[PDB]
Amino acid sequence: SLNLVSEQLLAANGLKHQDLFAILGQLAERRLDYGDLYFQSSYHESWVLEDRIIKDGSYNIDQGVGVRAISGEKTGFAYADQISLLALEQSAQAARTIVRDSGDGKVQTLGAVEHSPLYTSQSMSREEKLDILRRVDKVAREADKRVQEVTASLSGVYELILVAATDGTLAADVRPLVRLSVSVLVEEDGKRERGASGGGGRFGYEFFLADLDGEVRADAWAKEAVRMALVNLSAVAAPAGTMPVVLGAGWPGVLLAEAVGHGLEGDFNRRGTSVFSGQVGELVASELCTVVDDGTMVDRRGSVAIDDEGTPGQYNVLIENGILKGYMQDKLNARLMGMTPTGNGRRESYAHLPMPRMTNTYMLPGKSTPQEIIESVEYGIYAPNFGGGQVDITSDKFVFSTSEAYLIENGKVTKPVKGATLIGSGIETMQQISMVGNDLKLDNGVGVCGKEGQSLPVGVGQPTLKVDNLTVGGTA
């Protein structure tokens, strides 16, 4: 696997392992803690169905090398949209100017080690791909006469990476990723609404024609987009104020993944700018709460067989029975905090710097049934789906908008309600969790996380859970 990637990224571009030694040597002329070379090539394809036809398709290619020189807090960085000896030399000579002082030159010998495989290394025909989209269109339109528009898309990426560093690290990965997305519009008596579904992971397109609880997966997802659209078409104004909120299993995990997960990234905590800074050993959550970030999940969108620094993905317990245990790291922030790498050093591409980032972030299951949770609420909201939102990790605020939600009245789910924005404090919200369900699920393969302008594929999850008090931004 290292051999196969090396042939494509190095040998095919006129490079050998001794060229890596020479360029790392150029970096180590300066007084540095670390330097690395990061090689990448990818191909992306898409196909889109709309207005009952195959309307569009695209094919996008990128390739390049990025070079870093690191001393304490400091990083110098340069890169090129090509893989060649000249690009490496120019990039290294720019990056190393971060420090003027001479170094001892003593790098560690490059040596690769094994890691666990987490995903495979046209697999389907063009007409078979397009038949997935045609099937989604047919099933969605057949589901209800009010369905007027359907947009369905297929996206696929095949990515190769290789990293070599002054600490001896030599590592490679082969990364597939596919996504099916469906959006529908419904109309009745001049009123219109929309609904959406989809997912995927690190495998081929055949996943979309496999079984999901007795039906073809693509059919199930087409029907779900229609179901969502019709709920929204019927929904009435949401109430306003502080009340109990039951968050559904799966994608609603984005709210705490974002608020708490970003809060526990090591860059913020090393600088002291997170509300969680210096709090290891303290009760930051209800004793019912255990939160993990898990890079090891076979075939998942959010997983990392290695991260972008060559560190294998790990199962990291962040909060355990309410107690803060520690932080997600990259190599730079681990050194400065006196800690070790965790498998969280990720970069959008060769043209961007790595930093501490999430993989698959989720809360562990507890002892309550979802029915028991709903039956405990006299008046509140049940929120099984969200769009997106935003967080402030310094003052500890999150803001997330519902995409499917209902009143709870006298222990029963009742009327569907319109998009409402929930706002609160991450720590206070975790301390308000009084019931944790036995029904853990992750999202279907849809997560996108942004930090400092860099977007990455991630996972989120949780069981059903009860927040005793949370501010709901409705109108009624």
Binding site: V254, G447, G450
Partner: peptide, 5 residues
């Protein structure tokens, strides 16, 4: 610090 589906 902004996520979505």
């Amino acid at each position: 610090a902004a996520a979505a589906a």
